[PDB]
């Protein structure tokens, strides 16, 4: 606050305004066509040879499974969107039935760093210095000056790091792909560095399998990112166009008797502060 001797009138403090930014969510439409070719054959739970359940009940079983799988695919899409947002500050939503559009949340370009940990002469301190510098840039750029506690490595980054070197967290003991490497004290000073390695593999929209976290990079992030999971309007006469995380819909063709099953949703995962995180590429 300003020091003013009690003689004088006072001092006037200047205020600050705001940017505002707006986004449209993506749209997701998986559907299965359900022939008799899928209802008739035996599927895992069926009693194997004894006809204990009718075609109607086998249909009900397979439809329950497909609804469950649809929920799973939407949930996978939310994870993928959130991962893309946290890493890159943008998400390249794509498909066959969906042109590529880049939803840039506006991470400042300074927070997409690159250094070469494969070079000769690199020390553990140089690597930790790169991470500390990423934290510094984030602190200088964030809306709330927040310090990063969590640093998430790709597999290749973690291998390079270990090669050159040498409670809430319990929620991820049982989880595949997520590895909690504890902590390191190092020379960060500004905040103790929780270390994670993430190696989860997801099925791309070519059904090629790729890593959820860029393996050749390290991402720092903090809860201040305060991301919101956004769900837009369902552009469907079903459920009155209202906005839903996902909507399961089913209708049938009269002859031949083919069911169609479609779930659709309008997801977007938005980081409230796109600068509460950074991404460093460490490999060549």
């Amino acid at each position: 606050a300003p020091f003013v001797a009690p003689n004088v009138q006072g001092r006037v403090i200047k205020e600050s305004g705001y940017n505002t930014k707006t986004f449209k969510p993506a749209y997701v439409k998986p559907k299965h066509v359900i022939d008799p070719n899928m209802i008739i054959p035996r599927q895992p739970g069926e009693a194997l040879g004894t006809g204990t359940l009718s075609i109607a009940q086998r249909r009900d079983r397979v439809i329950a499974y497909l609804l469950m799988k649809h929920r799973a695919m939407h949930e996978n899409t939310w994870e993928w969107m959130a991962a893309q947002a946290a890493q890159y500050g943008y998400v390249d939503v794509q498909g066959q039935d969906y042109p590529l559009v880049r939803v840039d949340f506006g991470r400042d370009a300074a927070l997409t760093m690159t250094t070469d940990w494969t070079a000769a002469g690199v020390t553990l301190m140089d690597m930790i210095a790169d991470l500390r510098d990423g934290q510094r840039l984030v602190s200088d750029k964030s809306m709330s000056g927040t310090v990063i506690r969590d640093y998430i490595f790709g597999g290749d980054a973690w291998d390079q790091f270990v090669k050159v070197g040498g409670n809430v967290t319990r929620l991820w003991d049982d989880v595949e792909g997520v590895q909690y490497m504890g902590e390191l004290v190092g020379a960060n000073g500004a905040g103790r560095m929780r270390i994670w390695v993430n190696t989860q593999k997801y099925r791309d929209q070519n059904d090629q399998e790729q890593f959820l976290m860029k393996q050749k990079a390290v991402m720092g992030i903090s809860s201040a990112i305060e991301g919101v999971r956004c769900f837009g309007a369902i552009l469907d006469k079903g459920a009155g166009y209202q906005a839903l995380d996902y909507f399961p819909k089913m209708w049938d063709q009269e002859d031949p008797s083919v069911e169609y099953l479609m779930s659709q949703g309008a997801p977007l995962m938005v980081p409230a502060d796109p600068n509460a995180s950074f991404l460093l590429t460490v490999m060549s």
Partner: protein, 124 residues
């Protein structure tokens, strides 16, 4: 506008910053008179030889012309021939006003309004 946008996308709806006029708590005093030239909001204005408001211009002459002594601060923008309401008393934010070249630093921007009932100073 015909078609709704279906695809996802981003857009900056706008960036806003307060323009704080006042940097003090003195009496605020205002007049109004015809403009002689196009005047922006909070521009610093003199009066030309004809008595019309003209944006302030030091070094306008081998003897200083009356455009060279600031007389007020425009409260609204106006084209030539239009009436400009302008401030003649009050304590005003150094940075909000329409200064021009060579009148750059706060020292000069104060020297323009030393004795007047207008005064110019920093926001904290």
């Amino acid at each position: 506008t015909s078609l709704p946008n279906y695809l996802a996308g981003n857009g900056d709806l706008g960036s806003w910053e307060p323009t704080q006029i006042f940097a003090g708590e003195a009496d605020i005093v205002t007049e109004g008179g015809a403009a002689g030239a196009d005047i922006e909001i909070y521009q610093v204005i003199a009066k030309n030889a004809a008595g019309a408001m003209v944006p302030h211009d030091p070094t306008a002459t081998e003897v200083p012309a009356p455009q060279s002594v600031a007389i007020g601060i425009a409260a609204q923008p106006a084209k030539s021939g239009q009436n400009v309401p302008y401030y003649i008393g009050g304590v005003f934010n150094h940075a909000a006003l329409g200064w021009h070249a060579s009148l750059d630093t706060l020292a000069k921007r104060q020297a323009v309004f030393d004795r007047t009932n207008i005064h110019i100073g920093n926001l904290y």
